[PDB]
């Protein structure tokens, strides 16, 4: 929530924010506040089995939310409904491309560099956005 580009720090402002590593077991853990146990109160000597039933149901709603419905839009999708991008002010994703960056090695050829190599990665790529209709004034930003 920085208010001005001037509230950003050296690195961020010049290179952009940092993003998440590709997903793996250690970089895609369940949200840190994930419940590991759900307590349910009980009268000194008895337990309301009907309440216990509700308790679970309630928990279920809580979990679903924590695990994958943390964003309003996703909760509404949960019900089988939908939301315009104006509903939560989300930028509209118009096109997403992804590709691997490969290249070649350069062979060292002098007395000491003979048998050495330097990797030069150089990948060509196309990123094409199909004719899009702009309903209101604004910006079309493309990032990498």
């Amino acid at each position: 929530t920085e208010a001005n580009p001037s509230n950003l720090n050296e690195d961020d402002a010049r290179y952009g924010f940092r993003c998440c590593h590709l997903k793996n077991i250690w970089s895609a853990p369940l949200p840190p506040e994930t419940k590991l146990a759900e307590e349910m109160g009980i009268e000194s000597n008895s337990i309301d089995i009907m309440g216990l039933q509700a308790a679970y149901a309630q928990l279920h709603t809580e979990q679903e939310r924590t695990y994958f419905m943390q964003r309003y839009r996703d909760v509404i999708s949960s019900f089988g409904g939908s939301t315009s991008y104006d509903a939560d002010n989300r930028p509209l994703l118009v096109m997403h491309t992804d590709f691997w960056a490969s290249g070649y090695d350069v062979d060292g050829t002098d007395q000491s560099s003979l048998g050495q190599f330097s990797g030069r990665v150089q990948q060509t790529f196309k990123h094409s956005v199909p004719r899009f209709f702009v309903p209101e004034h604004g910006v079309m930003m493309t990032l990498a």
């Binding site: 998440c20 997903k23 949200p31 996703d74």
Partner: peptide
């Protein structure tokens, strides 16, 4: 030696990562 440079996608199978929502 094309695939050998790029770590697999693990696209086969079901969903593994629940992290609260969509994360690029």
């Amino acid at each position: 030696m094309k695939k050998a440079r790029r770590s697999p996608s693990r696209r086969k199978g079901a969903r593994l990562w629940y992290v609260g929502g969509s994360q690029f």
